[PDB]
Amino acid sequence: RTRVLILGVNGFIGNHLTERLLREDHYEVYGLDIGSDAISRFLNHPHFHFVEGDISIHSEWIEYHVKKCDVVLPLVAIATPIEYTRNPLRVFELDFEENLRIIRYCVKYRKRIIFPSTSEVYGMCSDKYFDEDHSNLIVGPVNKPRWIYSVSKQLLDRVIWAYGEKEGLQFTLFRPFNWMGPRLDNLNAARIGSSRAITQLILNLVEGSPIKLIDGGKQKRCFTDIRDGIEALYRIIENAGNRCDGEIINIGNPENEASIEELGEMLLASFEKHPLRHHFPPFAGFRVVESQDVEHMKPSIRNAHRCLDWEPKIDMQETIDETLDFFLRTVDLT
Numbered sequence: 001r002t003r004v005l006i007l008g009v010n011g012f013i014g015n016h017l018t019e020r021l022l023r024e025d026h027y028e029v030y031g032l033d034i035g036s037d038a039i040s041r042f043l044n045h046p047h048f049h050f051v052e053g054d055i056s057i058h059s060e061w062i063e064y065h066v067k068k069c070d071v072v073l074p075l076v077a078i079a080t081p082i083e084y085t086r087n088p089l090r091v092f093e094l095d096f097e098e099n100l101r102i103i104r105y106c107v108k109y110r111k112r113i114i115f116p117s118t119s120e121v122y123g124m125c126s127d128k129y130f131d132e133d134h135s136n137l138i139v140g141p142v143n144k145p146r147w148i149y150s151v152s153k154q155l156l157d158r159v160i161w162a163y164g165e166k167e168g169l170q171f172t173l174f175r176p177f178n179w180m181g182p183r184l185d186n187l188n189a190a191r192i193g194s195s196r197a198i199t200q201l202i203l204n205l206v207e208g209s210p211i212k213l214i215d216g217g218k219q220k221r222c223f224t225d226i227r228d229g230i231e232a233l234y235r236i237i238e239n240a241g242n243r244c245d246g247e248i249i250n251i252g253n254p255e256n257e258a259s260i261e262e263l264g265e266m267l268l269a270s271f272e273k274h275p276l277r278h279h280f281p282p283f284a285g286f287r288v289v290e291s292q293d294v295e296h297m298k299p300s301i302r303n304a305h306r307c308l309d310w311e312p313k314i315d316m317q318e319t320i321d322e323t324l325d326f327f328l329r330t331v332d333l334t
Contacts, residue, residue, distance in 0.1 A: 001026045001047070004237065005065050007055060007102065008075035010038045011191035015183050016230045017073070018042055021237070030069055032062070038183065055098045066105040071112045071237060074102045078190045079118070084149045094190060096152040103160055107169045114236055116192045117157050117173040117248065119297055120150040129300040132175065132248035140292050157248070164246055172236050172244040177252025177299050180319060181226030182326035195223065201264055202327050205271050208281030212289045217260035220296045224253045225319035228312040235308040243307045250299035253312035256319065257298060261286075270321050276328045 004021060006014050009031030015038055021027040022045060031039060032051040042048040053061055055076050066072055077095040084091055106113040122130040124138040137154060139147040163169035178195035185194045187203065204211045232251045236244050258266065268283060304310045 001028045002071060002237075003028045003030060003069035005030045005032065005069040005072045006075065007032045007053070007062070007073065008077075008191045009033050009050075010035045011075070011189055012038075012179070012183055012185045012193035012226070013075055013230075013233070014191070015039050016181070016226050017233060018048060020230055020234045022047055027237075030065060032065060055102065056094060059101070062102065063105045066102065066111055067109045069111065071114060072102065072106055073114050073116070074099050075116060075192045076190055077116075077192050079149065079192055080188060080196055081146065081149075084146050088145055088148045091149055092152055095149065096156060099156060100159065103156070103163065103169075106171075107163045107167050110168070110170075112170045112172075112239075113160070114172050114174065114233075115156075115160060117175045118150070118153045118192075119175050119177050119250070119252070119299065120294075121154040121157065121175070122297070123147065123150055124292075124294055127300075128296070129254065129298050130250065131300040132173075132250055132303055135300075144292050146292065170245055172239070172246075173248040174233060174236060175248070175250045175252075175299070176224070176229060177250065177297065178221055178223045179226050179229045179251075180223055180323045182323065182330075184323070184327065194226075195221075197221065197260065198223065198263065198267070198323065201267050202324060205267060205283070206280055206328070206331060208284055210284035210287040211264045211268075212287050213261050213264065214293070215290050216288060217264065217286075218295075219293060220257055220259050220298075221263065222252050222254055222298050223256040223258070223263070223316070223319060224251065224312060225314040225322070228253060228314055232304055232308055232310045235310060240308075247303060247307055249303045249307060250301055251304060252299040252301065253314075254298050254301060255312070256316045258316070266316075266320050267324060270317075270324050274325065274328060279333055280328070 010033035029048045032053040034054050078091045125135050127135045180195045184199045185191050
């Protein structure tokens with residue numbers, strides 16, 4: 001069976017992907033992390049193996065697991081906007097430098113790497129649908145430090161592309177668009193995966209704080225149910241016909257488009273009608289704040305159609321209700 005090494009497994013994607021792979025009978029999962037509270041249900045599974053580790057501290061121990069396995073998914077990274085400006089050097093050292101070392105272990109031992117790129121690489125791209133193969137990438141001047149994440153991730157995509165072109169590195173880049181569902185990562189966890197904007201909004205509802213609409217909350221976003229997203233990530237791992245080699249694949253649901261404001265109204269609506277509503281404070285309301293920014297982020301999914309015969313199937317309401325439902329029921333009221 002194929003050995004899948006998941007770095008930063010103690011979270012959203014690690015939980016859902018592991019469940020997916022274990023459901024099949026031909027994968028061996030190696031989930032590396034510093035904790036296991038998020039994937040404890042799998043610790044005793046015959047085909048799951050927890051590996052103690054941290055990609056900033058361990059060099060050898062991670063290199064060893066790369067050589068021991070077949071496919072590598074590096075999910076460790078700080079992807080919370082505030083931090084881009086708050087501690088840029090750390091965002092850069094972890095997201096760029098530490099991941100570059102893992103990319104190099106993969107080329108050294110000829111392993112397959114399925115790397116999480118970011119929808120932020122497109123930046124202020126003017127296309128209505130961001131295209132992995134034709135869209136131009138647009139960022140602000142260097143005095144707009146918010147772009148340090150976007151550009152760091154973009155450079156990594158290009159370095160992987162170069163290793164693939166000059167040193168036979170087998171790879172696939174995937175770019176998630178606001179994945180959401182049960183078991184969302186914590187707002188400040190350094191694990192790539194779940195939509196930060198929707199987890200913040202649910203947090204607003206749960207904590208009794210207002211939902212802040214930046215400059216009106218009119219900017220639009222696309223949202224993807226984790227059941228649709230993980231199915232696509234899973235098929236990239238399957239790699240039928242080797243159709244994913246050298247590919248860059250956006251994984252999102254371009255039909256689930258909504259502004260921060262509308263997303264807020266949809267969660268509130270599902271919130272007010274939920275059985276556990278009474279265990280949460282009254283709605284603090286919408287606060288129009290006013291602090292660069294991206295005004296729309298829609299993915300072209302032609303590559304996913306082509307390489308994976310994939311099409312998102314869950315309705316917007318279904319994703320909203322299930323993500324909110326799981327969250328409210330998992331919260332410790334003590």
